[PDB]
Design a binder for this molecule. Structure first.
Ligand code: FES
Ligand SMILES: [Mg+2]
Ligand SMILES: [Mg+2]
Ligand SMILES: [Zn+2]
Lengths: 157, 27, 103, 50, 88, 37, 40, 121, 159, 177, 99
């Protein structure tokens, strides 16, 4: 990990990086997710796994650095959005540029949030029994996760 | 009208019973 | 500790099969409450009437009317006002004088 | 289309049920349905139907 | 019909050379309401002899005194039924 | 902004974004090309 | 409940079918004399 | 037009895997059928109604014994969907005059000739 | 890290917690000890009232001594004649219970009852709904009834 | 056992006070538990004619949580009865005006649609925050498990727990990060 | 007409009352209603729903034993399915045969 220092003269210093735990359980896996047998076994709640692919201010790291495949990169990206919206990453908040403070508006607790709350409109005509409009819960990208329920998860609430 | 999960299974169960009925009428 | 249910609340459960395998024997002695799990009685200050009277204190206009009284009663017993109103004489005369009693 | 039919993992198929009158199903089916085998409904063609 | 069941209980336990019972509050619900339930257990040598329910603490304790006296005179509700079988 | 059923890029500089629950093509060179779904 | 499990064990699906519970006599005299056979 | 249906013969030609699944030998075929009505003939065509009465299956869930011969099988194929066909099995042999009154038909399809209502021991 | 190892996550393990059953050999020794203890309680007569679950007619009755049962049919027994109830599914005391699989042995439990009354039910009105219902298209059902008093429930140390 | 007639009856049909903590809980799951206790469906002696319900105290109702985008999608509708008196409010807007409204409305729908529902609602006590009146505290008998297990935040995780989880990937030395 | 039709309905409503009362009793020990009923059946215990309510209300200590027996049999079934049949059958999972 290299950091740029300015003085004009500016230079970048490379520092030693923490090393991955050796001897993955499943060597020969391309994606780092499959070298540890995590293909379908992580959700938004798993901050410990998700945090590793996140920039200090909450952005996702580029795929070419993480080494994830596209299928798992998109799942990590979506899980991170849901984790952020659930307030599970209090230390990866956006940087405040200058003369900006947090909105101070009270925070509503939410989880399994597919979309940004700003841009989702209210359902004014909810519909009757068979034309009921569904409130989406979870993400479609995680439709293949291992399920421990008798029936598949109820995405539309 | 989407067909329910319970409705689909009960038809399959009956089909299997009739499927065996084919076997026992073949000898 | 073979029982699959904790033995600490209702009774101890011991399930056993007879050697033949045709009877199931259950030994269930009751659990007594430990002394350390109890509180001392609040000796300093009682009939249930006294408790009732304090809750239904007569404060305004001596005896209150039906409206104010019923609202006081409803709050004390966590009921609605409607329960406390009387009924007419059709219903009152329909009520059985001697309802059946079981033990 | 041919690959889908061969590798289908559903034991039950429209053709077998229709031809054998399993479930008493032909009460609710047209005479032409046996030939179509569920692929064609009215003037519509259902490619995903094997 | 016996009044002051606690006084009787105390005398009986003295005859058995048993220590005087200590009343304590085993279970409690809705104390500050107008419909409170109290369970009071009489403890001897830190051992439970009888537990009784009541609308108030005094009523519950008085009931627990009767539960003990029933178990001392062998008149418990689950006592062996009377025997009418004998032809002899 | 013309709201159209199907959105299509109209020039090289046109680019696509997802703002406030809808897809937009925005063109810096020609504002005529701006579209919404 | 339990119909399929009873069938796997070789029993009647309905506990009211063939078995000791139904088919055995329900009572006898105190002296020991057997009771008249039940109509069912 | 709803009409009587003729099943292609291939349906009743079994496969080697079928014998393993149902545990029936293509040789030494079973002799007697156990047939029970498990569906209603209401809303079914009259020809299906007729055969059900001919076969004795008027009451549901009550077993009837029938011959495993082609003529009977032809009638059963008409109402195949409304019935369950189970092979009658005789673990202890045919009932005799002595054991005729001590039989019992088990749900397994086995006709026992001694019924004791006692633990096997 | 062994083959097929998954780091702990929300979905790594099933929601339920697997339980470890005790080994059969030790359990059987304890089972015999439990049975022996209960048998002594029966042998020494350390129990009070007993309650049994009995299958009579077509129904199951929770039964205890001095109890009254109503049977909705004639029984062919004279009034005042003592009977043995023979299908007991459960016999229970304050501190123990015995469960049949499905029925307890005759050696263990003997339940005795007496016929106290042979009677008929009160008139029950059976009127169906039909075109031109009328008030007289009515049937009265009266059924014979039998009342049994449970006399005793007894157990013996034959576990 | 061995009680007098009246004390036994009083004990059996006595009403209990339960505590629910609603912090980070879905209102519907809270409603299922509360609706069960309010009716008395938690007792083997339950009867629809017995009025055997219990008291339910729910706290932290301000801190309930919704799955999905229900905060912005779920709408509550009311009519004053006058022309033009139709109001439609989203869940967030209703929560802002009254922190306790959402929990009460979820429970109200789950109770049976009869006259006894109004009585049951009297036994329901909803507090927006942890503070409870002293008298209500003294009545309490038991607290109920939270229906939803709350996921932990990164800061909550201990240093030891972090080390236990493996470092799946290693960032290269030549990275800004 | 109402009285005659209510005669049939009364039997069904009583069964619904028993199932509710059984669910309340079994939930106190941590068991759902289906788990309580089926696993008792798998133990060859044929107590009916009407009697199970009487035991719950009036014989709580006996009813706890039934809950422990039902949970005990349920756990054996879980192990058995994972066992694949190589493992021997559970102690309480044995069936007393009749003939
Ligand atoms: S999990 Fe293997 S390619 Fe990503
Ligand atoms: Mg007519
Ligand atoms: Mg019914
Ligand atoms: Zn352009």
């Amino acid at each position: 990990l290299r950091e740029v220092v300015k003085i004009t003269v500016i230079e970048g210093r490379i520092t030693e990086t923490p090393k991955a735990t050796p001897d993955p359980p499943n060597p020969s896996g391309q994606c780092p997710i499959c070298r540890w047998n995590l293909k379908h076994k992580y959700t938004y709640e798993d901050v410990l796994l998700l945090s590793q692919f996140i920039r200090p201010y909450g952005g996702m790291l580029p795929r070419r650095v993480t080494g994830l495949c596209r299928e798992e990169h998109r799942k990590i990206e979506e899980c991170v959005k849901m984790a952020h919206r659930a307030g599970l990453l209090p230390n990866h908040r956006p940087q405040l540029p200058e003369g900006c403070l947090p909105k101070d508006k009270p925070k509503l607790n939410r989880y399994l949030t597919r979309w940004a709350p700003k841009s989702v409109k209210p359902i004014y005509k909810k519909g009757h029994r068979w034309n009921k409009v569904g409130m989406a819960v979870g993400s479609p990208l995680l439709k293949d996760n291992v399920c421990y329920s008798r029936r598949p998860l109820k995405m539309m609430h | 009208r989407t067909v329910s999960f319970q409705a689909k299974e009960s038809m399959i169960r009956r089909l299997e019973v009739e499927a065996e009925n084919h076997y026992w009428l073949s000898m | 500790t073979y029982s699959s249910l904790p033995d600490d609340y209702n009774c101890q459960v011991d399930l056993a099969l007879t050697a033949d395998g045709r009877t199931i024997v259950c030994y269930h002695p009751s659990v007594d409450i430990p002394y350390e799990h109890t509180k001392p009685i609040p000796q300093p200050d009682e009939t249930h009437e006294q408790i009732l009277k304090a809750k239904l204190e007569v404060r305004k206009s001596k005896q209150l009317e039906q409206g104010p009284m019923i609202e006081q009663l409803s709050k004390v017993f966590y009921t609605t006002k409607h329960r406390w109103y009387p009924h007419g004489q059709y219903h009152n005369r329909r009520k059985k004088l001697n309802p059946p009693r079981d033990r | 289309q041919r690959e889908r039919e061969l590798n289908n993992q559903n034991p039950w198929t429209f053709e077998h049920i229709a031809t054998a009158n399993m479930f008493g199903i032909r009460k609710f089916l047209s005479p032409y349905d046996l030939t179509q085998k569920g692929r064609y409904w009215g003037k519509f063609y259902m490619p995903k139907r094997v | 019909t016996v009044v002051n069941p606690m006084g009787l209980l105390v005398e009986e336990l003295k005859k058995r050379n048993i220590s005087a019972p200590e009343s304590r509050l085993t279970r409690q619900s809705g104390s500050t309401t107008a419909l409170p339930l109290y369970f009071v257990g009489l403890y001897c040598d830190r051992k439970l002899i009888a537990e009784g329910p009541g609308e108030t603490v005094l009523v519950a304790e008085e009931e627990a005194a009767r539960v003990a006296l029933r178990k001392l005179y062998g008149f418990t509700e689950n006592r062996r039924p009377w025997d009418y079988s004998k032809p002899k | 902004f013309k709201t159209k059923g199907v959105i299509k890029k109209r020039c090289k500089d046109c680019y696509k974004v997802k703002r406030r629950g809808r897809w937009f093509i925005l063109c810096k060179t020609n504002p005529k090309h701006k579209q919404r779904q | 409940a339990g119909g399929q499990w009873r069938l796997q064990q070789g029993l009647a699906a309905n506990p009211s079918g063939y078995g000791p519970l139904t088919e055995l006599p329900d009572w006898s005299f105190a002296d020991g004399r057997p009771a008249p056979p039940m109509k069912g | 037009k709803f009409t009587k249906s003729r099943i292609p013969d291939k349906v009743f030609q079994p496969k080697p895997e079928d014998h393993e699944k149902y545990g029936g030998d293509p040789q030494n075929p079973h002799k007697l059928h156990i047939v029970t009505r498990i569906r209603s003939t209401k809303r079914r065509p009259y020809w299906e109604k007729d055969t059900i009465k001919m076969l004795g299956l008027q009451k549901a869930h009550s077993p009837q014994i029938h011959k495993n011969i082609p003529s009977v099988n032809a009638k059963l194929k008409v109402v195949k969907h409304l019935i369950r066909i189970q092979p009658l099995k005789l673990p202890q042999g045919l009932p005799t005059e002595e054991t005729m009154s001590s039989t019992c038909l088990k749900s397994t399809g086995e006709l026992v000739v001694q019924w004791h209502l006692k633990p096997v021991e | 890290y062994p083959q097929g190892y998954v780091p702990k996550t929300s979905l790594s393990s099933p929601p339920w917690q697997e339980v470890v059953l005790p080994d059969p050999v030790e359990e059987t020794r304890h089972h015999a000890e439990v049975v022996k203890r209960v048998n002594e309680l029966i042998a020494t007569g350390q129990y009070g009232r007993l309650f049994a679950v009995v299958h009579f007619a077509s129904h199951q009755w929770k039964v205890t001594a001095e109890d009254l049962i109503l049977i909705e049919n004639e029984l062919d027994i004279k009034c005042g004649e003592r009977i043995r109830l023979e299908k007991v599914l459960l016999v229970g005391a304050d501190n123990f219970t015995l469960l049949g699989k499905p029925l307890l042995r005759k050696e263990l439990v003997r339940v005795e009852a007496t016929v106290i009354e042979k009677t008929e039910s009160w008139p029950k009105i059976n009127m169906k709904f039909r075109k031109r219902k009328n008030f007289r298209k009515k049937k009265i059902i009266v059924n014979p009834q039998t009342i049994l008093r449970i006399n005793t429930i007894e157990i013996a140390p034959r576990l | 056992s061995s009680f007098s007639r009246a004390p036994q009856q009083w004990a059996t049909f006595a009403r209990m006070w339960y505590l629910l903590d609603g912090k980070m809980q879905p209102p519907g799951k809270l409603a299922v538990i509360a609706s069960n206790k309010l009716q008395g469906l938690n007792k083997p002696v339950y009867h629809q004619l017995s009025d055997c319900g219990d008291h339910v105290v729910i706290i932290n109702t301000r801190h309930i949580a919704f799955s999905g985008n229900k905060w912005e999608q779920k709408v509550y509708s009311s009519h004053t009865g006058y022309p033009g008196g139709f109001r439609q409010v989203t869940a967030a807007q209703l929560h802002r005006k009254d922190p306790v409204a959402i929990v009460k409305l979820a429970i109200y729908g789950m109770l049976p649609k009869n006259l006894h529902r109004r009585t049951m609602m009297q036994r329901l006590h909803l507090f927006p925050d942890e503070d409870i009146p002293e008298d209500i505290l003294k009545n309490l008998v038991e607290e109920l498990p939270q229906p939803r297990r709350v996921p932990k935040r990164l800061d909550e995780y201990t240093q030891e727990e972090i080390e236990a989880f493996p470092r799946v990937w290693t960032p290269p030395d030549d990275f800004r990060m | 007409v109402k009285c005659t039709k209510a005669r049939r309905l009364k039997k069904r409503n009583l069964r619904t009352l028993w199932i509710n009362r059984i669910t309340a009793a079994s939930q106190e020990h941590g068991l759902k209603y289906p788990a309580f009923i089926v696993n008792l059946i798998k133990c060859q215990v044929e107590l009916n729903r009407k009697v199970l309510v009487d035991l719950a209300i009036y014989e709580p200590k006996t009813f706890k034993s039934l809950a422990a027996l039902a949970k005990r049999r349920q756990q054996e079934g879980f192990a058995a399915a994972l066992g694949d049949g190589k493992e021997p059958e559970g102690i309480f999972s044995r069936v007393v045969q009749y003939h």
